[PDB]
Ligand binder design. Sequence first.
Ligand SMILES: [Ca+2]
Length: 223
Amino acid sequence: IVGGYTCGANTVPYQVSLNSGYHFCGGSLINSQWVVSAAHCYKSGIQVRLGEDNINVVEGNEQFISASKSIVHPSYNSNTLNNDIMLIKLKSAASLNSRVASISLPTSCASAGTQCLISGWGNTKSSGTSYPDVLKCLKAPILSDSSCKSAYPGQITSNMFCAGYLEGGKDSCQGDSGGPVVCSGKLQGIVSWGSGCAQKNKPGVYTKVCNYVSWIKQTIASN
Ligand SMILES: [Ca+2]
């Protein structure tokens, strides 16, 4: 997260870190046994880390649980990042509490102008590299479809939306991928892609979760 703020420990209780020996992506807890992330974050050997603030220090609210299965969206295209969504099942159910909690799925899509909270342990520099140890947060609005499409000609599908600031300086970034965009207590987006980070006229691009609620629910019901 570039140009954000320190969230505070366990203030974002649905935020997860995906760990394969090191943090490599975010995710969102959507029930005691399932996490949503970005398909471009797929790898084998995932451990899900819940209850984290400092990802390099054991602070006392963590739960580390190995994934038993990952399911990439059936129409994911790694060239265009269309359908950049994956589900991860935990080998055991997490213990839900005030610091480890699920986030609701949307019953309806959000609109341009809605304010959302974006979070992660990604790079904090727009030109340069610096990785935080504690969770960072950014409040940002959803941008219009027309401004999103104008920013990225020929690249924005009906399964994407843009959020952030066209002036630059505030955005998600590398290492935030797969993490949440929450608006009015609903998971509306997944950190997907962008040109660089926090660049002028190049806002963040997010997976449009409301398009996938049917697939998520059916997949969970049968796995
Ligand atoms: Ca920790």
